[PDB]
């Protein structure tokens, strides 16, 4: 298995690594239907996805996509620096397919 | 997807933005029979409820349901500051259908 | 729907109100048969419970008997101020149906 | 029904009270098979065991089990004082039953 | 049963102790398809992985894999100190089996 986050990400097509070193600036989760999802944003503006679950996950993705969600809150409020998003470059915002958090 | 809360929330009927920039002042769970909900105020005595749930709920959305209210909880344990609600304000309360946290 | 847990309360029978406006005293749970359950104490002596789920409960009350716990645990190590709680009062110790946070 | 874990641990054959009145020294927690348990250490040198989930534990034990290893993870990270351990001292490590926290 | 770590670590093939004593550096979780995972890292550098749930998994270590995430990430946030990991050395990075938390 990989040893990173960068390592990891580049298994997968349709993928890049972004740098932030940065607490996340802006948390926000909704329960409307066919929306069930997470949106976080760094203070710069970039703009990051949890995305709702679909067809295009394997099940699972799907135990991992609530863990993420539930560690994007936390980190957010307890102001934790994140290292590193791998996300999916394919989707609007990017969807997080990764996260390290590193001092 | 949505870039932020404003454009989810408008991509559904019966619903309405509202800017708090505050901590919650309330927070009430209950597990009697038919009013498994939470209810959260803030000081101005805008109140809001995570509605029950119910028919007019996918599937999908119970998972979020339920998420939501862990998220109203920690934020008011955190005194973490609620920039935006979407709601639905063909109930009332007003029904929360999604969150976001900044500053 | 309700707005605030005394209007919760009140559609109930075999309920009352008891005004807290303190941090918890004590909390204990258990995973022995049968009193798989949770006790909550207040200074003043007033002792709570979460009863073990049962055939009194319907379906939906299964998860929010699971919440309760979570949020009266989280309520301790926090020493958050438990405003009121809505109990049942046909069982001993009374049986918490609602719980509210404020202050 | 019991007010306290002296009352409650009263109930059980093979059980005894321990008085702690400090908080956790180590937390031990393993996912090896068959050793799906938690051990719990104090500064007296005492050890207590969260069972792994057998055939000697009913339906309704095992979300109770679940959630006492919640209960002593977040215990031990926030440095909280266990008052009493409610144990089976058939088995070694002594088996929790349950647990009462205050100050 | 096992009174601590390093006796659990010892009923198992292809395990040793990794006796670290100090917090966790990095915590990286992803959840990309075939790769639902958390690696953690310490400041000397070295890595550990929460592996992927797979068929050398029986069902009982399911749950406590998902713990095993939950119970990292809580510790990397706090800045808890890791006292030792029992891991398995077959695999890169070593997977973990079990932590020991002490200050
Ligand atoms: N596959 C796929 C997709 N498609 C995904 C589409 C993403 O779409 C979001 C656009 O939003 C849907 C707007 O809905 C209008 C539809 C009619 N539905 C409703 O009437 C409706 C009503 C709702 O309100 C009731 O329920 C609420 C609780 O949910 C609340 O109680 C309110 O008070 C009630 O009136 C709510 C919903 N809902 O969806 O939440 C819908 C793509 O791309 C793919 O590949
Ligand atoms: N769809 C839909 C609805 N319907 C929802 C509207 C409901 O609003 C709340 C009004 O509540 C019910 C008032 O209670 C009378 C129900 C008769 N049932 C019971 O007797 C009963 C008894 C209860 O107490 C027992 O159980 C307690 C634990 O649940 C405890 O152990 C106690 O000691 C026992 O005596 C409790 C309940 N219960 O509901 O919690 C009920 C709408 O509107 C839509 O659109
Ligand atoms: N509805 C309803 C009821 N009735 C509820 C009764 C309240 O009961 C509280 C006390 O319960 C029974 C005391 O147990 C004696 C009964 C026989 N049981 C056992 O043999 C037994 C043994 C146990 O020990 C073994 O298991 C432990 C883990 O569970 C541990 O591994 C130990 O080492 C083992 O020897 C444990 C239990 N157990 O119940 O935990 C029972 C009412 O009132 C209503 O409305
Ligand atoms: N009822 C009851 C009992 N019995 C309870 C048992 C006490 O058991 C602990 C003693 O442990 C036995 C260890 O098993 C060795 C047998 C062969 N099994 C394995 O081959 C095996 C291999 C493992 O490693 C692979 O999987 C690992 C993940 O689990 C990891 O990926 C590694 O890299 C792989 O090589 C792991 C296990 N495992 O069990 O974790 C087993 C009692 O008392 C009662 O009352
Ligand atoms: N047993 C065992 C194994 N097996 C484990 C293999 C470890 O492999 C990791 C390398 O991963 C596969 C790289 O995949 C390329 C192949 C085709 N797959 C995809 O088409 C694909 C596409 C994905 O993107 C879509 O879905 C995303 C959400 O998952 C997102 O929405 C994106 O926008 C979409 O385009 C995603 C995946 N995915 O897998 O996540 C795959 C081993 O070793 C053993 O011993």
Redesign the interface.
């Given at each position: 298995?990989?040893?990173?986050?960068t390592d990891?990400c580049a298994?997968?097509h349709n993928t890049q690594i972004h740098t932030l070193n940065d607490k996340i600036?802006?948390?926000?989760?909704?329960?409307?239907?066919?929306?069930?999802?997470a949106?976080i944003?760094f203070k710069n503006g970039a703009?990051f996805?949890?995305?709702?679950?679909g067809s295009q996950?394997?099940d699972?993705?799907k135990?991992?996509?609530?863990?993420?969600?539930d560690?994007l809150?936390?980190?957010?409020?307890?102001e934790?620096k994140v290292?590193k998003l791998?996300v999916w470059n394919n989707?609007?915002?990017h969807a997080?397919?990764?996260?390290?958090?590193?001092?």
């Open positions: 298995t990989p040893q990173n986050i990891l298994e997968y600036f802006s948390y926000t989760e909704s329960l409307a239907g066919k929306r069930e999802m949106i944003t703009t996805q949890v995305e709702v679950p996950h394997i699972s993705q135990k991992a996509i609530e863990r993420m969600k560690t809150r936390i980190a957010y409020l307890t934790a290292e791998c989707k609007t915002p997080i397919a990764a996260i390290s958090m590193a001092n």
